[PDB]
Symmetry: D2
Subunit: 334 residues, 4 copies
Amino acid sequence: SMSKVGINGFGRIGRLVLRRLLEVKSNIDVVAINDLTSPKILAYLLKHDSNYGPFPWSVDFTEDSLIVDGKSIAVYAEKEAKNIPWKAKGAEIIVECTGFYTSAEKSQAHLDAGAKKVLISAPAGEMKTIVYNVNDDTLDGNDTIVSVASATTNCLAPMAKALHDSFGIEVGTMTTIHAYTGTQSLVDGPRGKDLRASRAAAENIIPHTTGAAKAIGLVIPELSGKLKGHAQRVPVKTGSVTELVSILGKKVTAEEVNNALKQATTNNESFGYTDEEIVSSDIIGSHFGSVFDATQTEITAVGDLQLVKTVAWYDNEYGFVTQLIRTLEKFAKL
Amino acid sequence: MSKVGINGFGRIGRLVLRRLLEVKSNIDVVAINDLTSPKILAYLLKHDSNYGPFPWSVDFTEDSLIVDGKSIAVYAEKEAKNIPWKAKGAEIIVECTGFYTSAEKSQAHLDAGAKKVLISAPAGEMKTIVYNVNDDTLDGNDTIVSVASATTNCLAPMAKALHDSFGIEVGTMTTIHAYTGTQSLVDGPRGKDLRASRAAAENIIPHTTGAAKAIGLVIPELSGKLKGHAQRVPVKTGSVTELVSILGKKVTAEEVNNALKQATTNNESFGYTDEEIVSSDIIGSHFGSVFDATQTEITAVGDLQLVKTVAWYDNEYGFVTQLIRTLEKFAKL
Amino acid sequence: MSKVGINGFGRIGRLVLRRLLEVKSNIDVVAINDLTSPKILAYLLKHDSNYGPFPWSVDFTEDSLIVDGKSIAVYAEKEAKNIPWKAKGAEIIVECTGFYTSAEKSQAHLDAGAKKVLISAPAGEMKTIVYNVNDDTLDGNDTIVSVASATTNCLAPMAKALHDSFGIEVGTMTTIHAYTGTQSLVDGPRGKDLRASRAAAENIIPHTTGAAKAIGLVIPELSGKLKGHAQRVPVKTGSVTELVSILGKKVTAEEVNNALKQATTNNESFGYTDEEIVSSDIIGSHFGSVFDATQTEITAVGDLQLVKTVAWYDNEYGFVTQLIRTLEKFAKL
Amino acid sequence: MSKVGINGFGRIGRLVLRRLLEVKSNIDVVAINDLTSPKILAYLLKHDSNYGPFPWSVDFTEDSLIVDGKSIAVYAEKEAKNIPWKAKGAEIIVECTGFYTSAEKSQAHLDAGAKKVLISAPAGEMKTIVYNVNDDTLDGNDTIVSVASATTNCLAPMAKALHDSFGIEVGTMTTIHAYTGTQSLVDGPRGKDLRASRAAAENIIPHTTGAAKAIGLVIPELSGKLKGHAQRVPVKTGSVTELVSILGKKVTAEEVNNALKQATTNNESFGYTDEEIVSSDIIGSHFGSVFDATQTEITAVGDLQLVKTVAWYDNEYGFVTQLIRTLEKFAKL
Ligand SMILES: NC(=O)c1ccc[n+]([C@@H]2O[C@H](COP(=O)([O-])OP(=O)(O)OC[C@H]3O[C@@H](n4cnc5c(N)ncnc54)[C@H](O)[C@@H]3O)[C@@H](O)[C@H]2O)c1
Ligand SMILES: NC(=O)c1ccc[n+]([C@@H]2O[C@H](COP(=O)([O-])OP(=O)(O)OC[C@H]3O[C@@H](n4cnc5c(N)ncnc54)[C@H](O)[C@@H]3O)[C@@H](O)[C@H]2O)c1
Ligand SMILES: NC(=O)c1ccc[n+]([C@@H]2O[C@H](COP(=O)([O-])OP(=O)(O)OC[C@H]3O[C@@H](n4cnc5c(N)ncnc54)[C@H](O)[C@@H]3O)[C@@H](O)[C@H]2O)c1
Ligand SMILES: NC(=O)c1ccc[n+]([C@@H]2O[C@H](COP(=O)([O-])OP(=O)(O)OC[C@H]3O[C@@H](n4cnc5c(N)ncnc54)[C@H](O)[C@@H]3O)[C@@H](O)[C@H]2O)c1
Ligand SMILES: [Cl-]
Ligand SMILES: [Cl-]
Ligand SMILES: [Cl-]
Ligand SMILES: [Cl-]
Ligand SMILES: [Cl-]
């Protein structure tokens, strides 16, 4: 069993990866970290978190390492993945969280740099892409580079799966009202080519493209090409919600849709259920990838024309991370 | 009837007066009712967190505002039946408190000596007006009317245009809506709406709204064919409405965009953009709705088609501009 | 041991219960009074926008909350003299409504059957306790006591240490303070504080506070020597207190900081940090005040010296841990 | 001189243009350098999250902006020496990038054919100007000059008036300051400054500034007498500076306010308010600083006296107005 892990990109997602690993007392062992800064700065960011608060374990550092819960972790500072000295500590599986290696072509650099497998924390083109407890059974021993898609995908997928299986989804469109992230702007200024991303993220509702629905065929093959959607990025720091409007393959009531979602969430560590009147901050630190909200279910019908709107919460930082880590633990034991 | 009183000199009520002054209306605000002192109403009029300084002079006396040199009586009667509207001859009441959103309740303004009420919110089965959609329905004998919600003013012009051009068979709405005074600053009781008891500037809060459900009051042919809800989020004003529809015809995005553009032409109430705007860009809008071509989306599989269309709105000032047009026509009957 | 009643199950009132259970306190909370239904209180206790899910089970009946399987009676009496405290034998009331902040007002809890009241806000000239500064001034005869504001609880430990080590000749205080429920979500009337009427999540808002003015109730040697005020800013909790002092002695930054470290040693109410923290890092703190040596500043010209000292506080949970420490001593008397 | 280039079409860079157009300056912006396309600078000039739509037409080509029907070249040179300032006759450079804050560094604008540079930030030991305090120190032989920070333009007028009337023997400043582009959107490395790495809109963030430390360049007799810092907070623009001074005379609050009223009278750079304003009320201010008499505070204990004076400022637009004033005068020498 491959127990030894490297994290590339010790950011929002990367830091939480470590946090979650120590929280579930995993046999997986983080032996090296690569970013662009000093151990001092990484230690400060790891110790102090604006969203989840103080790190639950001891954090200290050296000129070339972090010391977390008494255990030493090497820190490297290589912009180019192929130069990361992963063999020095035996980093076997790389959790790729930088945002700059989101393809097989790009992420294979880690293999050149001496790692064995790569798990990418973002969509990454047409490669094996896993949403745990939806399609993790498609994983095998020959998968060497894998994607876990976006938080949004981990939110949409299990909801869509439940619907697909119970009723059919003949066509649908998704809007996620999504917390702001590092790809957006603090103040109005250039942010590559996306004009909207240029705008101050905490002062606006900002429409934003996402591939979650578009590329859903990678997770649920039978819905391939049948979903579209987008994001409205809004001023909350983490916690998001996905709405899916579907034409289903069967006439339904709200109760029928809600019972089917309940069943699919039963005995399911990835996919939660609620009928409580919750709001976005209640999902912060969720250990699910998705939490279906029965109180938002809505059936609109005129004769035989039926629209069905299903809604699910997700903590796009930690909740997602819990999915990444479930996927990682299975990856390592193949 | 050129003389007006305002009940509820709140976010809507105050902007009502700003807008009347902005368009040099021959309507005359003579009286204002609220729950507080003139000092406090005057500070609030003078200094606005969303729109900045009042462009006119503002002073007060122990019973009045003086706005741009003109005296406006202030009353503090929590029951509308006790507002002395006849003292300064207030004929038309712009009801902006949120406590009289029905025929039965706003009757109190007429028992109190006014002739007409225009309610700044939905109010059941009464004439409900979205200006430049169904304003031709207003009548000389109408005494109590609604301008519905800001959300309704945003949805209706979009739904009207899609209805006329393609037909809407069924549809559902979500508005990503700026927070409002019906919500809470900090977590705490807010009557019986549990979601509304939560800190509004720190949460995405789902919230019910009749905008889609009551659309039949504005566009009879769409009666019962829409439903919808809001997601309240931390921006102070400026909101967006997404409508997802099954249309009566197969379409292209370009065809939808051009139909909509046609409907916005020479339309003081319904605006158009294909610029990559965000919500703060709608703050101060003088339209009730601004349709956004950049977010049009056609999802097609074989014969099936879903069409997502989206319009922005300044739920405060933009809605107010619709309220004033509706009031300018209401007063000349 | 003792049985308590909570009046005002609000931001402070709910966190009092959370903290009592977290420390496995002997105190049993037996009754709660507020203005609403058990359903609404259970919703609010369960789901907290600042601290997340309640760590215990929460349920309700028509007259009660059930928390970790223990029943707590719920009443809805706006006048404290009508709260049936005797029905469950609540002898110590934790007064958290904002409406009984005087000895004559909180007396009504004793007329209703309680023995002692601890008030969760400044309450005039009464025994006013900052735990680990002046908790020794409590005795078997006190029946109504105050714990001051969160700001007093931030200020008084810093001021006491400076007092004891160097003397404070005079000083002034400014706290950059999270917004609270006394402010407004949207621009609108809020009693006679004009500034409190303005949208709290969208402004820096100057705001009056007695923490400095009434510090003598907690540190008698400093009566009349300190003034200050707050700037309310848009963070939901997490506040910081700066104090500019002329000290009695003449000092280096290092020396100020050593004095404060000693004062924070084996002191569960008052903490120290030399880490570059920001306000969200204090959220959930089990201190009333955390002195920050990084912000210490000595400005000096000739024999003239200004000393600025800065301390953080979670005005919500942090304060509450102080209230609970004080509440535990006050029960045992 | 009437021919200017802007390096750094950022928050400050864009408002420079907006302001020159607002005052009908007979300076013309002929060229603009940044790191992006004309399409992106046009989108940004046209849509502003703080100040709304551009008041004038904005269009572009692949190498220019068309603003109010006039062409302005756009270049994208990382290094200032590589900028074709020569080409359109760029005489005075407004250096608003943050990256060329010295004489040596802004030299490069001269090495590429510009005469003068006006830097929009503190720039070490060079001629540093707060308009209507020390603009009389500008001469014809000046090439590279600074207008310091917004905080310096806030602090200087107030300090100047206190110094003239009473003397400041020593003093310390805290500015409660709107977040800027130098801070982080989410927790992440921002060079070596640990505090600047933290999410700016979710925290009160202590932060260093030289406004007080370098006041000597603006007010030579206050040299080395002041210190201070900032608490960055979650508002988008609009800040406030607090100064605690030991003055050279005993004073009342009335005496301190009248002296400030006098200094502000027919002073287009420095404003006065007796109204209970909040940060958003300063947004769009045409002053560098607005002294607020409602926050003046005198703490007296015998011969010892601390005086807190407080001034508001729009760190974006308000600072800009000072910049222009200085620019217009720099041009004519
Ligand atoms: N934030 C979310 O909501 C979220 C959710 C799910 C997935 N993701 C995805 O996870 C990835 C990381 O997101 P994030 O939000 O943590 O971003 P982030 O900016 O917080 O973190 C990126 C980290 O990588 C470092 N980095 C950048 N370039 C690098 C390089 N060449 N080499 C090494 N380190 C480098 C940065 O210094 C930073 O620590 C992205 O692909 C993102 O799309 C994000
Ligand atoms: N804010 C928006 O986005 C928006 C948009 C469109 C319509 N509306 C509607 O307009 C109405 C007002 O909304 P708002 O945002 O201005 O509310 P708000 O809370 O800002 O204002 C309400 C005003 O009414 C006063 N008031 C309350 N009860 C009263 C009584 N019994 N008598 C007299 N005055 C009383 C308050 O003091 C306050 O000044 C509501 O019906 C609301 O649904 C709001
Ligand atoms: N930062 C803080 O929030 C903080 C810190 C220290 C002290 N305090 C003090 O504690 C007290 C409460 O502050 P809060 O933030 O919890 O307020 P809050 O508004 O969150 O809580 C008040 C609660 O009291 C209830 N209430 C109001 N009037 C009542 C009455 N007559 N009878 C019974 N219940 C009533 C409300 O329904 C609400 O649940 C205040 O005196 C406040 O100054 C607050
Ligand atoms: N924001 C404020 O409140 C404020 C107030 C007073 C002074 N200032 C000062 O003004 C300057 C600009 O601040 P800002 O807030 O506008 O920053 P900003 O980040 O908005 O603007 C910086 C602009 O410079 C551009 N840029 C960066 N490097 C460049 C280069 N090498 N060549 C050309 N362009 C480059 C960026 O693309 C951006 O458009 C800073 O020096 C700051 O200290 C800012
Ligand atoms: Cl590489
Ligand atoms: Cl898509
Ligand atoms: Cl509905
Ligand atoms: Cl005081
Ligand atoms: Cl300094």
